[PDB]
Every structure is written in C-alpha cells, then in structure tokens.
Amino acid sequence: LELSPEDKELLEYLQQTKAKITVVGCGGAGNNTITRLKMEGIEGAKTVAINTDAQQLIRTKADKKILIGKKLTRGLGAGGNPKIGEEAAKESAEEIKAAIQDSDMVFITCGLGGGTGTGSAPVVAEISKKIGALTVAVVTLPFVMEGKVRMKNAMEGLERLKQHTDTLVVIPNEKLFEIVPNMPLKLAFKVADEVLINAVKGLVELITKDGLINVDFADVKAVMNNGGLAMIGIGESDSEKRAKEAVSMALNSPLLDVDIDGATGALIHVMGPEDLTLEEAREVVATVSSRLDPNATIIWGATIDENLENTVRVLLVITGVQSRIEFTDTGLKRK
Ligand SMILES: Nc1nc2c(ncn2[C@@H]2O[C@H](COP(=O)(O)OP(=O)(O)O)[C@@H](O)[C@H]2O)c(=O)[nH]1
Structure with missing residues (x-):
C-alpha cells in the first residue's frame, strides 16, 4: 500500500484505539455460546472454549479448546459440582494463561449454577487479572425452576467472580420469562442463548466492528475498569x-x-x-x-x-x- 507519512500517523493512531480481545466460554452453556459466536463470526476476538466434559468440548467450535482437569476427571465432566470445576481449572491454569496471554481485554462467559462454569469462571477471571487484562464477565443466573441448589451454587460463584472482575455483567434467566411467559424450559434455554450472544457479541463489536461511530478501547476501559456489577x-x-x-x-x-x-x-x-x-x-x-x-x-x-x-x-x-x-x-x- 502506498502510504504518506501523514497517512501512516493516522493509521498508527487508529491502531492504538484497538484491543486484543479474547472470549472464554466455560462449561456446557459457555461452550454453546462460543460455538454460536464462532459460526456467526464474531469480529476481532479470539474464541476459547474450556470444559471438563470432553464430549461437550469436542463438538464445540472455537479458535482454541482446552480440556481442563485432564488428571482429575479424565474428560468426564464435573457433575454439577463447582468444587470439581474450580480444581480442574486450577490444574490447567498454565494452559488457560497461555491461551489468553497478551490480551488487552478478556470476556469470561458461562451459565452459572452448574459445576464446570461456576467453578472455572472465577479461576479464568483471576488468571486474566494477573496478566493485566481488562476482565469482564458476562454470566447468567439459572431459572427458578432449576431448583434451590443450582441458584445457591450460582450465587456462590457470582461472589467469587466479583473478587476477580473489573465489570461483572449478570443476566438473570428468570426475567426471560417476562419476555416469553410459559415457554418450555428447553426452548427458554434457546432464548437464553440469543441473549448471551447479543450481550457478548454486542459488547465486543462495540469496540471491534466497523461502525458509523467506533469506540476507542481507552473509553471502554474508562467505564469498565471499575464497572462493578452490571x-x-x-x-x-x-x-x-x-x-x-x-x-x-x-x-x-x-x-x-x-x-x-x-x-x-x-x-x-x-x-x-x-x-x-x-x-x-x-x-x-x-x-x-x-x-x-x-x-x-x-x-x-x-x-x-x-x-x-x-x-x-x-x-x-x-x-x-x-x-x-x-x-x-x-x-x-x-x-
Ligand atoms: N443459554 C443456555 N444456558 C444453559 C443451557 N443449559 C444450561 N444452561 C444454564 O447454565 C447453567 C449451567 O449449565 P451447564 O453449562 O450445562 O453446567 P456446567 O457444564 O457444569 O458448567 C444452568 O444452571 C442453566 O441455567 C443452554 O443450552 N443454553
């Protein structure tokens, strides 16, 4: 490309408004989110899928896949136990770190309430913070009909995430039933899919996608650095x-x-x-x-x-x- 010194300086300015972004999806729901983002073509972001369950992980579409807790659960899963998901992520901490290294911003996404997502999400968030990245979680809380144990586990995971996030975006799935009342649970999860996609893709592409009005990463960082609960x-x-x-x-x-x-x-x-x-x-x-x-x-x-x-x-x-x-x-x- 034929570029003048003035054109080069303009390109240099625009380059420093950009950010290296990685989206990490944890567990079943998180992996499903990653697959959809990879298929639809999320712009300017690396997609990483992590899971204890090898069956769920292999059918996922992602730039990078990490089977966590290889020496712990042998690809079986976590069976809804957050402690197993946490321990698995800690075992594979170096592999997680390597996949998100040099990211300016890391999105951590999952459905809270299960084992892998609830357990691993705060670990990924902690690893992200330690590499100096702007650390944003976009997570769901379970439907009421999923039971008290699922919600209790989810809320304990939300507390752990809060300790290691710059902004914690929380989506209560129960409120989806105000948008689509009396939807069958299996189809309500498909609505939850769309909302998660819209939230994650919408936040990422606010920065990365070509627009009428583009956003400087510096301006996003100014709001999200201490965004707290969102x-x-x-x-x-x-x-x-x-x-x-x-x-x-x-x-x-x-x-x-x-x-x-x-x-x-x-x-x-x-x-x-x-x-x-x-x-x-x-x-x-x-x-x-x-x-x-x-x-x-x-x-x-x-x-x-x-x-x-x-x-x-x-x-x-x-x-x-x-x-x-x-x-x-x-x-x-x-x-
Ligand atoms: N969006 C979406 N959410 C789900 C789906 N299945 C389960 N969830 C939600 O995510 C939470 C954890 O489920 P899951 O990801 O399968 O558990 P995990 O693999 O052990 O982390 C559940 O309590 C549900 O609220 C799904 O297919 N789509």
Whole structure:
C-alpha cells in the first residue's frame, strides 16, 4: 500500500484505539455460546472454549479448546459440582494463561449454577487479572425452576467472580420469562442463548466492528475498569419511530433487574440496517442520558447489522449498580 507519512500517523493512531480481545466460554452453556459466536463470526476476538466434559468440548467450535482437569476427571465432566470445576481449572491454569496471554481485554462467559462454569469462571477471571487484562464477565443466573441448589451454587460463584472482575455483567434467566411467559424450559434455554450472544457479541463489536461511530478501547476501559456489577437491557423495533421504541424497550427491559437510578456508567450499542442514521443513534443516547443520573459516564457506538432489514436494535449495559443490589443464596435482591 502506498502510504504518506501523514497517512501512516493516522493509521498508527487508529491502531492504538484497538484491543486484543479474547472470549472464554466455560462449561456446557459457555461452550454453546462460543460455538454460536464462532459460526456467526464474531469480529476481532479470539474464541476459547474450556470444559471438563470432553464430549461437550469436542463438538464445540472455537479458535482454541482446552480440556481442563485432564488428571482429575479424565474428560468426564464435573457433575454439577463447582468444587470439581474450580480444581480442574486450577490444574490447567498454565494452559488457560497461555491461551489468553497478551490480551488487552478478556470476556469470561458461562451459565452459572452448574459445576464446570461456576467453578472455572472465577479461576479464568483471576488468571486474566494477573496478566493485566481488562476482565469482564458476562454470566447468567439459572431459572427458578432449576431448583434451590443450582441458584445457591450460582450465587456462590457470582461472589467469587466479583473478587476477580473489573465489570461483572449478570443476566438473570428468570426475567426471560417476562419476555416469553410459559415457554418450555428447553426452548427458554434457546432464548437464553440469543441473549448471551447479543450481550457478548454486542459488547465486543462495540469496540471491534466497523461502525458509523467506533469506540476507542481507552473509553471502554474508562467505564469498565471499575464497572462493578452490571446488567443489560435489549430493545428492538421496526416501526416509523424505530429508534425511540427500541431505546424505550431497552430501558424497560426485564433484564435490567435493578433501580437504574443507582447506575454510575453505561455502554450503548445502537445497531441497525444500512439506512441507520447518526440522528437515530443520538436520539437513543439522549434518551438514556436523560433517564440515568446526570453524573453517569456514558460511552456509545453505532454499527450496521446486515441481518437487520428494517429493525433498529439497542443494547444497553448499565454499570455500577452494586449499591442497589444485595447478593443472597436465592438470587439478587433489590436494596
Ligand atoms: N443459554 C443456555 N444456558 C444453559 C443451557 N443449559 C444450561 N444452561 C444454564 O447454565 C447453567 C449451567 O449449565 P451447564 O453449562 O450445562 O453446567 P456446567 O457444564 O457444569 O458448567 C444452568 O444452571 C442453566 O441455567 C443452554 O443450552 N443454553
């Protein structure tokens, strides 16, 4: 490429706004998330799948696969015991470290409540912190119908994650039943899949994807470095006032299971068809800004999704909500 000294300096500036990003999916649900991200083609991110279960791991699609606890469970799994998942991850700590080495940002994703995910996720998070990466977890809490043991295990895992994350994005699966009431559990998991994909892919591609408005990693780091506890809101609309309806739906999302007045920061990803305008994106941001505390630090981007024909989708990630939430054995309680 023919490049002038001025063009080179411009390219150098744009390069330092980028980040090396790795997404790590732990356990059954985490592996399923990774497969979907790999097939759909998540932009600018390395995908790593880890599991104690060799049957689940081998059918997963990923850039890198790690069978954890080879000398512990021999590829059998963890049988829903978080202690087994934790010990397996600790055994394979060096292999996990090698796979995420030199990442500027690491996403850790799983369904909390099981053995492998609940156990290994905090270990991956600890390893990520120790390599100096911006460490973000995007995790689900189980449905109520899964039982008390699953939720108790999940909440203990959430407490361990909190010790080793910069931002902890929590998605309560139970609130999906407000979006799709009385859905069969097996199909409700498929909805949970889509939400996890939207959350992880949406956060990653806010930084990595070509957009109308691209985001500097420095600005993401400024919000997410001490993001604490975070929750998401998703909205979509294809009407005449698509942007207004999408942001309204996002702000009123059941997944935002918190008083949003306690928020100290926010990430906004506006997604639309080829006809998406800056004016539409600005309308979304202005609506969020007016609703939140005036002192909240808001970072936003806008990208074109080719799969969308007439629909604008808004992903909202609200940070610093730990002051309005209490961690209990039965789940998240509003304070
Ligand atoms: N999105 C999604 N979540 C799931 C699925 N299966 C289970 N989960 C959730 O993830 C939690 C842990 O399940 P799983 O990943 O299979 O356990 P693990 O392999 O031992 O970590 C469960 O308590 C469920 O709430 C699935 O197919 N999709």
